[PDB]
Ligand binder design. Structure first.
Ligand SMILES: O=C(O)CCC(=O)C(=O)O
Ligand SMILES: O=C(O)CCC(=O)C(=O)O
Ligand SMILES: O=C(O)CCC(=O)C(=O)O
Ligand SMILES: [Fe+2]
Ligand SMILES: [Fe+2]
Ligand SMILES: [Zn+2]
Ligand SMILES: [Zn+2]
Ligand SMILES: [Zn+2]
Ligand SMILES: [Zn+2]
Lengths: 287, 279
């Protein structure tokens, strides 16, 4: 069935957005971030960007070679820590996706991904293939990941807009070789618009056919708390973590999370934040 | 059926075979007498009662016990001897290598049951992970429990009870039998009862008037699953005293999930990115 990529404003709310996500596996959120947020986030991000270093021999390297990438963005962005990790729409959607089979959720990875002119694109893939039990289960897998992929520049068919196959989250055989990326639908989007897809939906970065345009995307992937994050929370200094809200702290791997009633990521099997005396919403004063 | 026993010297292949067939095996002399003495010496002064009011899966099974967890924080012998043990690593490589790749520590505790302690209901350890509860028998291997006796383990004093073969039963959601139908792992100090997360087991009833029965569960887990014990509780200073391999077990290095690097810094190697020292 030759399907369509649907588009829905941020103001429609999480119920309406979640419904298209269930039916299609992917939806465009218009105005996920405002223009002002995109400007400020870009300002914070610019000076830390660089090329992906080859020689890793990993799953990451197979899909991320040729891209400019920065990850562990809690370390580099106040707007990430304070605005995005407390966003009510993000949390409403995560509660609906992950609540039934997993309970709690948290950040697995977030990156800024900039594709240069001539970048050839990715093969279509499902994001849940980073987790081996989900690869084994295929369609029968529980929901494990949710990717909020925000456009930080214009996203066009020509400049490499992320390509998606609506409905692929419901195909019978997830191990079948995926189709060519050019049969998929590019998520044409203005800055601040985000393409939202589960870890079960076939997608990939498009070919950048321009001569002079750097196409900047912002994947932010939330994950079921029972699965180990791609990005380690031990990289964050305690001092920085203590500037965030309790909820943001929990997303970045410094609080206890409940896996269907099972407390995990604990200190002495009890609450983590209590055990280590973790502070929150700290604000350093000019003194 | 019977609970089988194999000496530590027989090696990982022989031990792994009984584990596949029975889901549970006694390793004679997993730790030496001298290790048990020294480990006990280190552990003694930090023990306390489980605090109620947690409203968790942990609390449902651990109420009434004395417990200490996050044992890398309290024991040099844990950090240096146990986290580098060749037999532990040989068995984990065999259990987890096929479906998961790497593995690491999820939880380890000292569990002391007092006289009168009523025992646990029989349970499978993989029910701490929701996807494994859903899959039941069809679940991939997720956990391996090396449960070492730190005092004598007797039928009467609450030796851990196990049902050999329960890892192969068709229906994992069927209500388990009474704990007193299961076989107690009678053991000397340093012997360990080894079982997968799919095998029905539980701490026994302590029917003595005067014996404190001290067990030492050490649970390794497939790296794709979040640990029960958080690695952010460990200060960096302490982690840097351990070997690279021990560091990896306690959640401070990158682990490979069937070729997928996870627990990374900037998607690259964690230890490199944060400049992590060792030994
Ligand atoms: O059209 C359908 O319902 C799916 C059929 C199909 O692709 C299959 O099961 O092989
Ligand atoms: O950056 C994009 O457009 C897609 C990235 C992606 O799908 C991935 O790297 O897993
Ligand atoms: O300490 C014992 O004997 C068994 C403990 C146990 O099975 C558990 O707490 O999961
Ligand atoms: Fe992807
Ligand atoms: Fe248990
Ligand atoms: Zn609503
Ligand atoms: Zn079919
Ligand atoms: Zn738009
Ligand atoms: Zn051998």
């Amino acid at each position: 069935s030759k399907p369509t990529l649907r588009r829905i404003p941020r103001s429609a709310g999480d119920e309406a957005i979640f419904q298209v996500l269930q039916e299609d596996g992917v939806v465009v959120i218009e105005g996920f971030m405002s223009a002002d947020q995109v400007r400020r986030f870009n300002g914070e991000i610019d000076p830390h960007m660089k090329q992906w270093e080859l020689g890793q021999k990993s799953y990451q390297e197979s899909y991320l070679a040729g891209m400019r990438q920065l990850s562990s963005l809690p370390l580099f962005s106040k707007l990430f820590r304070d605005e995005l990790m407390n966003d009510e729409l993000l949390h409403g959607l995560c509660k609906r996706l992950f609540g039934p089979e997993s309970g709690d959720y948290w950040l697995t990875t977030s990156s800024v991904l900039e594709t240069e002119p001539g970048y050839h694109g990715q093969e279509l893939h499902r994001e849940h293939d980073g987790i081996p039990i989900c690869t084994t289960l295929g369609r029968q897998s529980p929901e494990s990941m949710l990717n909020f992929l925000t456009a930080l520049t214009d996203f066009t068919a020509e400049n490499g807009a992320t390509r998606v196959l609506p409905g692929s989250h419901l195909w019978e055989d997830f191990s079948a070789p995926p189709p060519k990326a050019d049969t998929a639908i590019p998520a044409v989007m203005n800055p601040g618009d985000a393409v939202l897809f589960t870890g079960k939906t076939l997608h990939g970065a498009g070919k950048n056919n321009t001569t002079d345009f750097l196409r900047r995307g912002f994947p932010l992937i939330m994950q079921s708390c029972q699965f180990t994050p791609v990005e380690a929370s031990v990289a964050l200094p305690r001092e920085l973590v203590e500037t965030m809200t309790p909820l943001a702290q929990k997303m970045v791997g410094w609080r206890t999370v409940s896996a269907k009633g099972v407390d995990i990521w604990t200190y002495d099997l009890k609450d983590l934040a209590t055990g280590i005396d973790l502070k929150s919403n700290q604000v350093a004063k000019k003194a």
